[PDB]
Amino acid sequence: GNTLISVDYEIFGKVQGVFFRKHTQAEGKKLGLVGWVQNTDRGTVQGQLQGPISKVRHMQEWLETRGSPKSHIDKANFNNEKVILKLDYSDFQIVG
């Protein structure tokens, strides 16, 4: 059992109408992460990532430069980066 972290994310850019949520869920699962992703009312994509630090950090880089193939990302805001006792999530859902 490694040090587990959680981080909140919000992604600004051409991120809706580009299958962003599907590809986020897929990549999170590929990297062994749990959490969630949704569209927000301000046109951004938002969620949390939880998992081992190297895995979360990789997904953070994904969210900074890549996302779904047709998306382009202006900014990824991260906050509430915290060490956690255990995962709060058992899967990675698209929730909104």
Residue numbers in the entry: 3 to 98
Extract from the study:
We then questioned whether the introduction of the salt-bridge into the mesophilic homologue would result in the same observation. Crystal structures of HuA99 and HuG99, resolved at 1.5 Å and 1.7 Å, respectively, demonstrated that they were superimposable with a Cα r.m.s.d. value of 0.17 Å. In a good agreement with our original design, the salt-bridge between the C-terminal carboxyl group of Gly-99 and Arg-23 at the active site was only detected in HuG99, but not in the pseudo-wild-type HuA99. Importantly, the activation energy (52.5±2.5 kJmol−1) for HuG99 was analogous to that for PhWT (49.1±1.4 kJmol−1), while the activation energy for HuA99 (29.5±1.9 kJmol−1) and HuWT (37.6±3.1 kJmol−1) was comparable to that for PhG91A (32.1±1.7 kJmol−1). The distance between the C-terminal carboxyl group and the guanido group of the active-site arginine residue was less than 4 Å throughout the entire simulation of PhWT and HuG99, denoting the presence of the salt-bridges in these proteins. In the simulations of the salt-bridge bearing PhWT and HuG99, the side-chains of the arginine residues populated mainly the native mtm180° rotamer conformation.
Here we used a pair of thermophilic/mesophilic acylphosphatases homologues (acylphosphatase from hyperthermophilic archaeon Pyrococcus horikoshii (PhAcP) and human common-type acylphosphatase (HuAcP)) as a model to study how local flexibility of the active site affects the enzymatic activity. Despite remarkable conservation of sequence and structure at the active site, the catalytic activity of the thermophilic PhAcP is significantly poorer as compared with its mesophilic homologue HuAcP at low temperatures.
